[PDB]
Amino acid sequence: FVHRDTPENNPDTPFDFTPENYKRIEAIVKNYPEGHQAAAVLPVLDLAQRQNGWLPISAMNKVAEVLQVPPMRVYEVATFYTMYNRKPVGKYHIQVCTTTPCMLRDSDSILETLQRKLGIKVGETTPDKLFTLIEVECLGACVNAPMVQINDNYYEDLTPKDIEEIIDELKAGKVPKPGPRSGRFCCEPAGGLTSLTEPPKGPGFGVQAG
Amino acid sequence: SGVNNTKKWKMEFDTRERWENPLMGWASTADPLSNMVLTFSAKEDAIAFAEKNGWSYDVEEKKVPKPKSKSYGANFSWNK
Amino acid sequence: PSGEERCIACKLCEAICPAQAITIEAEPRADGSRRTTRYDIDMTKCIYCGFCQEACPVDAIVEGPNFEFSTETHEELLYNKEKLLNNGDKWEAEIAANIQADYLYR
Amino acid sequence: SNLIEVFVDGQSVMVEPGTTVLQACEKVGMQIPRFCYHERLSVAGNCRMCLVEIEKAPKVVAACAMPVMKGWNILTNSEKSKKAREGVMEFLLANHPLDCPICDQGGECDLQDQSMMFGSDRSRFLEGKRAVEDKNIGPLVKTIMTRCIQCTRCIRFASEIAGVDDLGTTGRGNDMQVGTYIEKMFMSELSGNVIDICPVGALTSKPYAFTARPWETRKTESIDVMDAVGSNIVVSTRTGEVMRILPRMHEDINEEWISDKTR
Amino acid sequence: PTQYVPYSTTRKKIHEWVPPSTPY
Amino acid sequence: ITHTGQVYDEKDYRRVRFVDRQKEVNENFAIDLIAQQPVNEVEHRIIACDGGGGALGHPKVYINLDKETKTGTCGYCGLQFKQ
Amino acid sequence: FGSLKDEDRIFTNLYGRHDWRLKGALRRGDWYKTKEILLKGPDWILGEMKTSGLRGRGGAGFPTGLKWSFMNKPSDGRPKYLVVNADEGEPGTCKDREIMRHDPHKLVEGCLVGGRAMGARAAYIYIRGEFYNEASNLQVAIREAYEAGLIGKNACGSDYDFDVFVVRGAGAYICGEETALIESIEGKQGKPRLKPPFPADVGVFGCPTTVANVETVAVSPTICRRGGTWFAGFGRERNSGTKLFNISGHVNHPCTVEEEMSVPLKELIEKHAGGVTGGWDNLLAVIPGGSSTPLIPKSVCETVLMDFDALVQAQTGLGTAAVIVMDRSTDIVKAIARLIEFYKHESCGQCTPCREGVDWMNKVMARFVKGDARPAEIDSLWEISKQIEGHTICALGDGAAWPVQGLIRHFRPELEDRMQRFAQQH
Amino acid sequence: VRPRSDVTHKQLSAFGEYVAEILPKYVQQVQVSCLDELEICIHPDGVIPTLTFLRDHTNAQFKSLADLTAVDVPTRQNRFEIVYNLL
Amino acid sequence: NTYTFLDLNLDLS
Ligand SMILES: Cc1cc2nc3c(=O)[nH]c(=O)nc-3n(C[C@H](O)[C@H](O)[C@H](O)COP(=O)(O)O)c2cc1C
Ligand code: SF4
Ligand code: SF4
Ligand code: SF4
Ligand code: SF4
Ligand code: FES
Ligand code: FES
Ligand SMILES: [Zn+2]
């Protein structure tokens, strides 16, 4: 965790919120309680990430500036969270869930397939600078275990060739039907809806007295 | 941060010449009572030792850390 | 072996010497490493206890096999770093064999 | 009034409401082994080397933190509060680099002592150790920070006693390193105090790097003449030349701190 | 298998202001 | 002169002791010997340094050869390690 | 005995099937008695939960009513607050992902129903940043509700004022912790605080605050509507109410069903969800509450049922009630090993026992999977485990120790053999 | 841990009272150390009397004097602590 | 959309 100034990643890279971005900023502060600019740094840091994935040292200094906080304060927030990237991020940035639930349901299986398809090691960007694979931890959505979040694509329940299919979709064209490519809906017993197969009771159903 | 060496009073004789030795450069001292530091449990007893032995004394009052109020909740106060 | 003297001036060989024989003063060598500017064992003060051999973490100071170092003048018996380092170079082969034989025991 | 009655292994002292469990032990005279707690620095609870056992309580409490309540007898030398120290010291030492004959806070270590008095005779960490990367914090403080026990007293002092607010924690897990994210020197007066306040010898003084070792230093208590605050100081002399000047506490004038100039 | 002279190796410890050689 | 450079000036008294005698100085001056030591290349981010021989070396330390910018130097052997 | 009726089931919109949006919510009739409830009084709302005896729906189990009762004390001039943590970093907790995504409204009225119970000025919902799409769904829902005037000043045509906000998480499991959610909300690093200054006393921005699992906030409006008793009956003794159960891994149809609590463990895989993949005898072990809770082996599996009292008797925790199942086809030594890898990549490092201890167990666990480590080391990991369990500032160190303790407790012979296997091939 | 034999701790304690009763004068603070060792403490005037009783008493014959020493506690008003060890 | 959650925030504001 040390930013050794590099021509690419260093403040020479000027950063400033787009007129549109700055707007987004003000909104954030107000959402937070009055006189508390500091709470807004994680959201403001997120929009710097939205602006640019790299988010270099220059970008964090601006965040601290806009939020008038000790610069270190922003540096500490960026380092602690994995969501922020302090290094350039691939356009797609796929992340594969490899906690025990997904592994038990084959998460590892998927990995090998994706490494071959992207033809690259796990953890770095494709030469095409189009893809970036990382072994991220539990991303939620375990019921659907095989899983790979690509910039919130959160594709889930994915068989190996599925991903290959998805990756191809990403490689040529866009928006490859993000979601559980499996037939099931959201999370649902693959069998059906044992929980509630009847119609839902309407408003004020069996509302207790009092 | 240990305070077990700030408990007993000590009386120490005044420091004297420590000239360098020409042959080996070791420190050399002509004062016999230099390395002697006697330890006394209470200020009254140490003063007594100086009076009967005839050495001059200049007692320094013990200064103990003042009580300081601390509470983990207090710094969490955004107000201050 | 490389040739860098083992002592790193932790100075506990000075601390445990019973006779106050070893005098060590140190300063960071330009390399940035830690070395002793002056290491003086006063052999007339030393009572050859062998604790220094014991205490050294890098085992830089060792009790060498030679017992025949009788000297015409008292000053020769006082030893600075250069005599001891020279003593170390002369007897290193046997010192290494001796430490080799007894280290499992220690 | 405002004198709760709390028991220290029975001495039954009476203390102001709001005094920490560690503070209650102090007035009886007992010392809770502590790291990351400094009297004039905010309580942080990072080390938890101070876990004690209030009587009739399921878990041990953080001394520096729990405000002592009414009639809770502290058991500072119980069979539990010693396994709560014999097992913490196991951890601090596990990732520690054993270069105690490099660490010039050799005899000035609050971590060997507490290990050597309250910790364990042997180690069980058969696994490997970690290493951090030494950086430059300036020309006065040598930060061999692979020594750091992540006790966050620096980050406090550098924010609370001095208003530098530069030093900070970076990252999570066992590679949380408490060093400036970008290499900006810690330039401020009051800077050298970090040395005195880091109980570990991670960052120590660069001029007094390896000139001495504390048992030898003869310590004479004198007065600061560089500035007119007249801060109390202790001049540590070995064989007749001054080796270091470090602060000695005067409640009114310099309360444990001295300027970068006068040390 | 098939006269020393002792001296202090440490240098000076207190240096001395050398008079200005410029007369005034 | 010697490892430290202890030397006696012309005006310096305390240099007579060598008159008609010899001084103890060292060839194989260590200051340059490790500098003469090749940089131990390694694969791992961190590496150990028993000093060579375990019990017959130095209290083991793990050095972070993490930045090619700097070859870690075990504070005990002065051996530079080239990532 | 489970088998809750669909009508009784809380989130009818579970599995979608009904517009998660307001018009679907109106057919759900989620906003039916909201004005009345708030009108009744804050004291009436807490009477309802005290009668319900609901336990925390998050990993920790505590009476929900007593927790809310704590900051019902008179305001000291600081605005009281509500914090809803939609973060669920724990493996198998895809549960809360449902209410948020499928039925956002239920949680919106849960927030104001809960808000007047604690007299909170406003509620902040910390949905994990990972779920960006999920966030898109709730503020669309929150926006609908205010447009309606259901929330905002004079919310639901009543004297009371409430504002609901959504906060972005940033991929941290620890952010989930009650004192650490706050600090992330405060904008400092997500590092838990000590409990002495309790969350109500010094909450967020030094203003009294309370934290609830999203499930806990969501059920409060329906429990007030159905009354504590209705809800109280389903549960068992202290245990009570239906809690969503997620079954993931080695089961024929992994799914989250809100079937009743106190369900025989053998029954929920066998009757709902999908029977254990490979047969109920192909069950090397069950993780009842998620990664933090100790796994229970099949022997005790069916005997015990899913309720917090029964599980604590069993030495395991109901927790998030995430059932992770491991067939006889899995290297548990490696399964639990990745959960310790799950915790070394995630603990904040603020406290000494978790920082080095969790890393220490990770190193030993990796050697255990290889079998390189000797048999005597096993017990030491145990001793390392309890050093971490009682000494940590937060509960995650509590959580890291339990899976290690479970592996040694029931699968000690298998680890010894892996010990033996490597020693034989030399 | 040293092999303490409580059998001793008791017998020597019992003698310590015996002596304390026999010579109520000149004898104070009689205590048996945790080292199975008794250390009657006597007023300086009881030097002659307490020793003689121990040298010539059938139930306590202490014929030889192992040592006579004087620790010096400078703090203590009475600086020296003459200690007589008898067998 | 990358900014859809954030744009949804302004309207709430
Ligand atoms: C490491 C850690 C992570 C946690 N993560 C969550 C979480 O993601 N969601 C949650 O509701 N509770 C989580 N908790 C439990 C909280 O500390 C707290 O007890 C709970 O959120 C309170 O909600 P409840 O009282 O409504 O159950 C976590 C606890 C720990 C120690
Ligand atoms: S000799 Fe051994 S012990 Fe004495 S200083 Fe040099 S190294 Fe440390
Ligand atoms: S700090 Fe320096 S001295 Fe104290 S233990 Fe670690 S290394 Fe040895
Ligand atoms: S540097 Fe010294 S003070 Fe700052 S954290 Fe590491 S140890 Fe604690
Ligand atoms: S246990 Fe200590 S380290 Fe692990 S998370 Fe809670 S606080 Fe941070
Ligand atoms: S572990 Fe992969 S989403 Fe829960
Ligand atoms: S000393 Fe107890 S918290 Fe650091
Ligand atoms: Zn080395």
Coordinates of N, CA and C in Angstrom, one line a residue, chain A residues 30-34 36 38-43 46 50 73 76-77 79-84 95 97-101 103-105 135-144 149 152 154 156 180 184-210, chain G residues 6-7 9 11-12 15 17-18 26-29 32-33 40 44 81 89-92 94 97-98 101-102 124 128-133 165 167-168 170-172 174-175 184-191 205 225-227 246 248 250 253-255 257-258 272 324-326 330 334-335 338-339 341-342 345 348:
Chain A
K30 N -25.8 16.8 0.8 CA -27.0 17.1 1.5 C -27.7 15.8 2.0
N31 N -27.5 14.7 1.3 CA -28.2 13.4 1.6 C -27.6 13.2 3.0
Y32 N -26.3 13.4 3.2 CA -25.7 13.2 4.5 C -26.1 14.4 5.5
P33 N -26.0 14.2 6.8 CA -26.4 15.2 7.8 C -25.6 16.5 7.7
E34 N -26.3 17.6 8.1 CA -25.6 19.0 7.9 C -24.3 19.2 8.6
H36 N -21.5 17.7 7.9 CA -20.7 16.4 7.9 C -20.2 16.1 6.5
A38 N -17.4 14.8 5.7 CA -16.6 13.6 5.7 C -17.4 12.3 5.3
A39 N -18.6 12.2 5.7 CA -19.4 11.0 5.3 C -19.5 10.8 3.8
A40 N -19.5 12.0 3.1 CA -19.6 11.9 1.6 C -18.4 11.5 0.9
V41 N -17.3 11.2 1.5 CA -16.1 10.8 0.8 C -16.1 9.5 0.1
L42 N -16.8 8.5 0.8 CA -16.9 7.1 0.2 C -17.8 7.3 -1.1
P43 N -18.9 7.9 -1.0 CA -19.7 8.1 -2.2 C -19.0 9.0 -3.3
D46 N -16.5 7.1 -4.9 CA -17.1 6.2 -5.8 C -17.4 6.8 -7.2
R50 N -16.4 6.1 -10.7 CA -17.3 6.2 -11.8 C -16.7 7.0 -13.0
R73 N -7.2 11.2 4.9 CA -8.5 10.6 5.3 C -9.0 9.9 4.0
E76 N -6.9 6.7 3.2 CA -7.2 5.6 4.0 C -8.5 4.9 3.5
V77 N -9.5 5.7 3.2 CA -10.8 5.1 2.7 C -10.6 4.3 1.4
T79 N -7.9 2.8 0.3 CA -7.1 1.6 0.5 C -7.9 0.5 1.2
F80 N -8.7 0.9 2.2 CA -9.5 -0.1 3.0 C -10.5 -0.9 2.1
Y81 N -11.2 -0.2 1.2 CA -12.3 -0.9 0.4 C -11.7 -1.5 -0.9
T82 N -12.2 -2.7 -1.3 CA -11.7 -3.4 -2.5 C -12.5 -2.7 -3.6
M83 N -13.7 -2.2 -3.3 CA -14.6 -1.6 -4.5 C -13.7 -0.6 -5.3
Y84 N -13.1 0.3 -4.6 CA -12.2 1.3 -5.2 C -10.9 0.6 -5.9
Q95 N -15.4 -10.4 -12.0 CA -14.8 -10.8 -10.7 C -15.5 -12.2 -10.4
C97 N -16.6 -15.3 -8.0 CA -16.8 -15.5 -6.5 C -16.3 -16.9 -6.2
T98 N -15.3 -17.0 -5.2 CA -14.7 -18.2 -4.9 C -14.7 -18.5 -3.4
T99 N -15.8 -18.1 -2.7 CA -16.0 -18.5 -1.3 C -16.4 -19.9 -1.3
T100 N -16.5 -20.6 -0.1 CA -16.8 -22.0 -0.1 C -18.2 -22.3 -0.7
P101 N -19.2 -21.5 -0.5 CA -20.5 -21.8 -1.1 C -20.4 -22.0 -2.6
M103 N -17.6 -22.4 -4.4 CA -16.6 -23.5 -4.6 C -17.3 -24.8 -4.5
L104 N -18.1 -25.0 -3.4 CA -18.8 -26.3 -3.2 C -19.7 -26.5 -4.4
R105 N -20.3 -25.5 -5.0 CA -21.2 -25.6 -6.1 C -20.3 -25.3 -7.4
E135 N -10.0 -12.9 -8.5 CA -10.7 -13.8 -7.6 C -11.3 -13.1 -6.4
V136 N -12.5 -12.5 -6.6 CA -13.1 -11.8 -5.5 C -13.8 -12.7 -4.5
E137 N -14.2 -12.2 -3.4 CA -14.8 -13.1 -2.4 C -16.3 -13.1 -2.5
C138 N -17.0 -13.6 -1.5 CA -18.5 -13.6 -1.6 C -19.1 -12.4 -2.1
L139 N -19.8 -12.4 -3.2 CA -20.5 -11.3 -3.8 C -21.9 -11.3 -3.5
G140 N -22.4 -12.1 -2.5 CA -23.8 -12.2 -2.3 C -24.4 -13.0 -3.4
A141 N -25.7 -13.4 -3.3 CA -26.3 -14.2 -4.3 C -25.5 -15.5 -4.4
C142 N -25.7 -16.3 -3.3 CA -25.1 -17.6 -3.2 C -26.0 -18.7 -3.7
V143 N -27.3 -18.6 -3.4 CA -28.2 -19.6 -3.9 C -27.9 -19.9 -5.3
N144 N -27.5 -18.8 -6.0 CA -27.0 -19.0 -7.4 C -25.5 -18.9 -7.1
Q149 N -19.5 -11.5 -11.3 CA -19.9 -10.1 -11.4 C -19.0 -9.3 -12.4
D152 N -21.1 -5.2 -12.2 CA -22.5 -5.4 -11.7 C -23.4 -6.2 -12.6
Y154 N -23.4 -9.2 -12.4 CA -23.8 -10.3 -11.5 C -24.4 -11.5 -12.2
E156 N -25.3 -15.0 -12.7 CA -25.2 -16.0 -11.7 C -25.6 -17.4 -12.3
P180 N -29.0 -14.3 -14.1 CA -28.8 -15.8 -14.0 C -29.3 -16.4 -15.3
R184 N -34.5 -20.5 -14.0 CA -35.1 -20.0 -12.8 C -35.1 -18.5 -12.7
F185 N -36.1 -18.0 -11.9 CA -36.2 -16.5 -11.8 C -35.6 -15.9 -10.5
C186 N -34.8 -14.9 -10.6 CA -34.1 -14.3 -9.3 C -33.6 -15.5 -8.5
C187 N -34.0 -15.6 -7.3 CA -33.7 -16.9 -6.5 C -35.1 -17.6 -6.5
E188 N -35.2 -18.8 -7.0 CA -36.5 -19.6 -6.8 C -36.1 -21.1 -6.8
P189 N -36.8 -21.8 -6.0 CA -36.5 -23.3 -6.0 C -36.6 -23.7 -7.4
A190 N -35.6 -24.4 -7.9 CA -35.6 -24.8 -9.3 C -36.9 -25.6 -9.6
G191 N -37.4 -26.3 -8.6 CA -38.6 -27.0 -8.8 C -39.8 -26.1 -9.0
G192 N -39.8 -25.0 -8.2 CA -40.9 -24.1 -8.4 C -41.0 -23.1 -7.3
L193 N -42.2 -22.8 -6.8 CA -42.5 -21.9 -5.7 C -43.2 -22.5 -4.6
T194 N -42.6 -23.5 -3.9 CA -43.3 -24.1 -2.8 C -43.7 -23.1 -1.7
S195 N -42.8 -22.1 -1.5 CA -43.1 -21.1 -0.5 C -44.5 -20.5 -0.7
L196 N -44.8 -20.0 -1.9 CA -46.1 -19.4 -2.1 C -46.5 -19.7 -3.6
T197 N -47.3 -20.7 -3.8 CA -47.8 -20.9 -5.1 C -49.2 -20.4 -5.2
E198 N -49.8 -20.0 -4.1 CA -51.2 -19.5 -4.1 C -51.1 -18.0 -4.5
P199 N -52.3 -17.4 -4.7 CA -52.2 -15.9 -4.9 C -52.0 -15.1 -3.7
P200 N -51.3 -14.0 -3.8 CA -51.0 -13.3 -2.5 C -52.2 -12.6 -2.0
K201 N -52.4 -12.7 -0.7 CA -53.6 -12.0 -0.1 C -53.5 -10.6 -0.4
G202 N -54.6 -9.9 -0.5 CA -54.6 -8.5 -0.9 C -54.4 -7.6 0.3
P203 N -54.7 -6.3 0.1 CA -54.5 -5.3 1.1 C -55.4 -5.5 2.3
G204 N -54.9 -5.3 3.5 CA -55.7 -5.5 4.7 C -56.2 -6.9 4.9
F205 N -55.4 -7.8 4.5 CA -55.8 -9.2 4.7 C -55.6 -9.7 6.1
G206 N -56.6 -10.2 6.8 CA -56.4 -10.7 8.1 C -55.6 -9.7 9.0
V207 N -55.8 -8.4 8.7 CA -55.1 -7.5 9.6 C -55.7 -7.6 11.0
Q208 N -54.8 -7.8 11.9 CA -55.2 -7.9 13.3 C -55.9 -6.7 13.8
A209 N -56.9 -6.9 14.8 CA -57.6 -5.7 15.3 C -56.7 -4.9 16.3
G210 N -57.2 -3.8 16.7 CA -56.5 -3.0 17.6 C -56.0 -1.7 17.0
Chain G
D6 N -48.9 -20.0 3.1 CA -48.5 -18.9 2.2 C -49.1 -17.6 2.7
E7 N -50.4 -17.6 3.2 CA -51.0 -16.4 3.7 C -50.2 -15.9 4.8
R9 N -47.1 -16.5 5.4 CA -45.7 -16.1 4.9 C -45.6 -14.6 4.8
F11 N -43.1 -12.4 3.1 CA -42.9 -11.7 1.9 C -43.5 -12.5 0.7
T12 N -44.7 -12.2 0.4 CA -45.4 -12.9 -0.7 C -44.8 -12.6 -2.0
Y15 N -39.5 -14.3 -4.7 CA -39.5 -14.9 -6.0 C -40.1 -14.0 -7.0
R17 N -42.8 -12.5 -8.9 CA -44.2 -13.0 -9.2 C -45.3 -12.0 -8.9
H18 N -44.9 -10.8 -8.4 CA -45.8 -9.8 -8.1 C -45.0 -8.5 -8.3
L26 N -49.3 -2.3 -3.5 CA -50.7 -2.0 -3.1 C -51.6 -3.2 -3.2
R27 N -51.4 -4.1 -4.2 CA -52.1 -5.3 -4.4 C -51.6 -6.2 -3.2
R28 N -50.4 -6.1 -2.8 CA -49.9 -6.7 -1.6 C -50.5 -6.1 -0.3
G29 N -50.9 -4.9 -0.4 CA -51.6 -4.1 0.7 C -50.5 -3.9 1.8
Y32 N -51.2 -0.7 4.4 CA -52.6 -0.8 4.7 C -53.0 0.0 6.0
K33 N -52.3 -0.3 7.1 CA -52.7 0.3 8.4 C -51.5 1.2 8.9
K40 N -51.4 5.0 16.7 CA -51.6 4.2 18.0 C -50.5 4.7 19.0
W44 N -47.2 1.6 21.7 CA -48.0 0.5 21.0 C -47.2 -0.4 20.1
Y81 N -31.5 8.3 15.2 CA -31.4 7.8 13.8 C -31.8 6.4 13.6
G89 N -22.6 -9.9 3.9 CA -21.3 -10.3 3.3 C -21.2 -11.8 3.6
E90 N -21.9 -12.2 4.6 CA -21.8 -13.7 5.1 C -22.2 -14.6 3.9
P91 N -21.4 -15.6 3.6 CA -21.8 -16.6 2.5 C -23.1 -17.2 2.8
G92 N -24.0 -17.4 1.8 CA -25.3 -17.9 2.0 C -26.4 -17.0 2.4
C94 N -27.9 -14.7 0.7 CA -28.5 -14.1 -0.5 C -29.9 -13.7 -0.1
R97 N -30.9 -10.2 0.0 CA -30.9 -9.7 -1.4 C -32.3 -9.8 -2.0
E98 N -33.2 -10.6 -1.4 CA -34.5 -10.8 -1.9 C -35.4 -9.6 -1.6
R101 N -34.3 -6.5 -3.4 CA -34.6 -6.5 -4.8 C -36.1 -6.8 -5.1
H102 N -36.6 -7.9 -4.5 CA -38.0 -8.3 -4.9 C -39.0 -7.4 -4.2
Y124 N -31.0 5.5 7.2 CA -30.0 5.3 6.1 C -29.9 3.8 5.8
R128 N -24.9 -3.2 0.2 CA -23.6 -3.4 -0.2 C -23.4 -2.9 -1.6
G129 N -22.2 -2.2 -1.8 CA -21.9 -1.6 -3.1 C -21.9 -2.6 -4.2
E130 N -21.6 -3.8 -3.9 CA -21.6 -4.9 -4.9 C -22.9 -4.9 -5.6
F131 N -24.0 -4.8 -4.8 CA -25.3 -4.8 -5.4 C -25.6 -3.4 -5.9
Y132 N -25.1 -3.0 -7.1 CA -25.5 -1.7 -7.7 C -26.9 -1.8 -8.2
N133 N -27.2 -2.9 -8.9 CA -28.5 -3.1 -9.5 C -29.5 -3.1 -8.4
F165 N -32.8 7.1 3.3 CA -31.6 7.3 2.4 C -31.0 6.0 2.1
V167 N -27.2 4.2 1.3 CA -25.8 4.5 1.3 C -24.9 3.4 0.6
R168 N -24.0 3.8 -0.3 CA -23.2 2.8 -1.0 C -22.1 2.0 -0.2
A170 N -18.9 -0.6 0.2 CA -17.7 -0.8 -0.7 C -17.1 -2.2 -0.6
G171 N -17.8 -3.3 -0.8 CA -17.2 -4.6 -0.8 C -16.5 -5.0 0.5
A172 N -17.1 -4.7 1.7 CA -16.4 -5.1 2.9 C -17.4 -5.9 3.8
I174 N -17.0 -6.7 6.9 CA -16.9 -6.0 8.2 C -17.8 -4.8 8.2
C175 N -18.0 -4.2 7.1 CA -18.8 -3.0 7.1 C -20.1 -3.4 7.7
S184 N -18.5 3.6 8.5 CA -18.6 3.7 7.0 C -19.6 4.8 6.7
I185 N -20.7 4.8 7.4 CA -21.8 5.9 7.2 C -21.1 7.2 7.6
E186 N -20.3 7.3 8.6 CA -19.6 8.5 9.1 C -18.5 8.9 8.1
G187 N -18.1 8.0 7.2 CA -17.0 8.3 6.2 C -15.6 7.9 6.6
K188 N -15.4 7.5 7.8 CA -14.0 7.0 8.2 C -13.9 5.6 7.7
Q189 N -12.7 5.0 7.9 CA -12.4 3.6 7.6 C -13.4 2.6 8.3
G190 N -13.8 1.5 7.7 CA -14.8 0.7 8.3 C -14.2 -0.2 9.4
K191 N -14.0 0.4 10.6 CA -13.3 -0.3 11.7 C -14.3 -0.3 12.9
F205 N -22.7 10.1 14.0 CA -22.6 11.5 14.2 C -23.0 11.9 15.6
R225 N -49.2 -5.3 12.0 CA -50.5 -5.6 11.3 C -51.1 -6.9 11.8
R226 N -50.3 -8.0 11.8 CA -50.8 -9.2 12.2 C -50.9 -9.4 13.7
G227 N -50.2 -8.5 14.4 CA -50.2 -8.6 15.9 C -49.0 -9.5 16.3
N246 N -31.9 -19.9 3.6 CA -31.3 -20.1 2.3 C -30.5 -21.4 2.3
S248 N -27.8 -23.6 0.2 CA -26.9 -23.5 -0.9 C -25.8 -24.6 -0.9
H250 N -24.6 -28.6 -2.7 CA -25.0 -30.0 -2.5 C -26.4 -30.3 -2.1
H253 N -32.2 -28.6 -5.3 CA -32.8 -27.3 -5.8 C -32.5 -26.2 -4.8
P254 N -31.2 -25.6 -4.8 CA -30.9 -24.6 -3.8 C -31.8 -23.4 -4.0
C255 N -32.4 -22.9 -2.9 CA -33.4 -21.8 -3.0 C -33.6 -21.1 -1.6
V257 N -36.3 -20.2 0.9 CA -37.8 -20.3 1.2 C -38.0 -19.7 2.6
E258 N -39.1 -18.9 2.7 CA -39.3 -18.4 4.1 C -40.2 -19.3 4.8
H272 N -38.7 -29.1 1.3 CA -38.7 -28.0 0.4 C -37.4 -28.0 -0.2
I324 N -25.5 -24.2 4.4 CA -24.6 -24.6 3.3 C -24.3 -26.1 3.6
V325 N -24.5 -26.9 2.5 CA -24.5 -28.4 2.7 C -23.3 -29.0 2.0
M326 N -22.6 -29.9 2.6 CA -21.4 -30.5 2.0 C -21.5 -32.0 1.9
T330 N -16.6 -33.7 -0.7 CA -15.9 -32.5 -0.5 C -14.8 -32.5 0.5
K334 N -10.3 -28.4 3.2 CA -10.2 -27.2 2.2 C -11.4 -26.3 2.2
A335 N -12.6 -26.9 2.5 CA -13.8 -26.1 2.5 C -13.6 -25.0 3.6
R338 N -10.9 -22.3 3.0 CA -11.2 -21.0 2.2 C -12.0 -20.0 3.0
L339 N -12.7 -20.5 4.0 CA -13.5 -19.5 4.9 C -12.5 -18.8 5.7
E341 N -9.5 -18.3 4.6 CA -9.0 -17.4 3.6 C -10.0 -16.3 3.4
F342 N -11.3 -16.6 3.6 CA -12.4 -15.6 3.5 C -12.2 -14.5 4.5
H345 N -8.6 -12.2 4.1 CA -8.8 -11.2 3.1 C -9.8 -10.1 3.5
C348 N -10.7 -6.3 9.5 CA -10.1 -4.9 9.4 C -8.6 -4.8 9.9

